Amino acid sequence: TQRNETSNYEVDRTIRHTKMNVGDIERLSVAVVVNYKTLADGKPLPLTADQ
Amino acid sequence: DRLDAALRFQQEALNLRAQRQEILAANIANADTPGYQARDIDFASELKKVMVGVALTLTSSHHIPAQAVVDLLYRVPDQPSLDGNTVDMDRERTQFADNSLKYQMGLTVLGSQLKGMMNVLQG
């Protein structure tokens, strides 16, 4: 037995050219502080877990 | 090419003479093999067949080009041997000498045609 096989293929091709924007954000860290709650009496009652 | 068409007939005749020469010499060499049949080719019919293909398409550079890759007639026996060998010395010796002569004649004709095509150009 003898099998000689030659195949020429055409392939899908996708070229993407990208120029990233200058000034993008890499990592953002934010510090927020809130106050207590002073009722009509004036006692600074702290907030709750849900809030 | 037109140059091939002019020299096609003599080249095919020369190649067929070489092939038949090989076949006749194989018949001579295997003369003593018991059960060997003497084979030969009909020169004229095979010359018609050769004188009377599709390279695969190459889209780019990497694509690989297409890769390329006669009928033997039994001789009618003359004398019946006991070991089944039908090779006759005299017949194939004459055929061998004739094929040698015709190969030389084909070489002469092809060389003359090439030499004429050359002296047309020389100047």
Swiss-Prot record, chain A:
Belongs to the FliF family. This is Flagellar M-ring protein. Residues 1-9 have a biased composition (Polar residues). It is found in: Cell inner membrane; Bacterial flagellum basal body. The gene is fliF. The basal body constitutes a major portion of the flagellar organelle and consists of four rings (L,P,S, and M) mounted on a central rod. The M ring is integral to the inner membrane of the cell and may be connected to the flagellar rod via the S ring. The S (supramembrane ring) lies just distal to the M ring. The L and P rings lie in the outer membrane and the periplasmic space, respectively. The M ring may be actively involved in energy transduction. It comes from Salmonella typhimurium (strain LT2 / SGSC1412 / ATCC 700720). Induction: Inhibited in nutrient-poor medium.
From Swiss-Prot, chain B:
Structural component of flagellum, the bacterial motility apparatus. Part of the rod structure of flagellar basal body. This is Flagellar basal body rod protein FlgB. One of its GO terms (biological process) is bacterial-type flagellum-dependent cell motility. Its main location: other. It is found in: Bacterial flagellum basal body. Disruption phenotype: Defects in flagellar assembly process. The keyword Cytoplasm does not apply. PANTHER family: FLAGELLAR BASAL BODY ROD PROTEIN FLGB, FLAGELLAR PROTEIN. It comes from Salmonella typhimurium (strain LT2 / SGSC1412 / ATCC 700720). Belongs to the flagella basal body rod proteins family. InterPro entries: Flag_bb_rod_N, Flagellar_basal_body_rod_CS, FlgB. It comes from the Bacteria. GO terms for cellular component: bacterial-type flagellum basal body, rod.
